Amino acid sequence: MTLKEQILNDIKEAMKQKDDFKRDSLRTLNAAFKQIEVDERIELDNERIYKIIASEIKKRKDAIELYLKANREDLAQKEQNEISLFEIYLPKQLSDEELTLALKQLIEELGVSSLKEQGLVMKEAKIKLGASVDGKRLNLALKELL
């Protein structure tokens, strides 16, 4: 069962269990999927789905902060509740020890040797590892190795 099928199945379940918030949030996610599929004439693999989710979460993290500056705790919580629903679909995250071996391997593949190449390693690691590690952890582990 595909990731798209998984999300559509959760929309149906939300409808049958009368959880309107879950229905509406996941339909928002599915609307984003179909827009990219139509605009780009592609089929979504899990990797592209992760990027779509990550971008929708990042936008909401940004909104939560503007809402708090606007004294609207209600709005921030709602956006945060949306993130919790979207995060469920993200892949297993690499452990600290797994992240280290992966970076050591990739650093040898690139021939890097110093922090002056960290920007190059950051971009390449985000491609090779994808949604299995976030930027912050990747940044912190690169500093320790280079």
Q: What DSSP string runs through the chain? A: --HHHHHHHHHHHHHHHT-HHHHHHHHHHHHHHHHHHHHHT----HHHHHHHHHHHHHHHHHHHHHHHHTT-HHHHHHHHHHHHHHHTTSPPPPPHHHHHHHHHHHHHHHT--SGGGHHHHHHHHHHHHGGGS-HHHHHHHHHHH-
Resolution of this entry, Å: 2.1
Q: How was this structure determined?
A: X-ray
From 74, 49, 79, 47, select the one nearest 62 (Cα to Cα). 79
Cα gap 84→39, rounded to integer Å: 27
Which overall architecture, per CATH, does domain 3-87 show?
A: Orthogonal Bundle (1.10)
Backbone φ and ψ for 111, nearest 5 degrees, come out as 75, 20
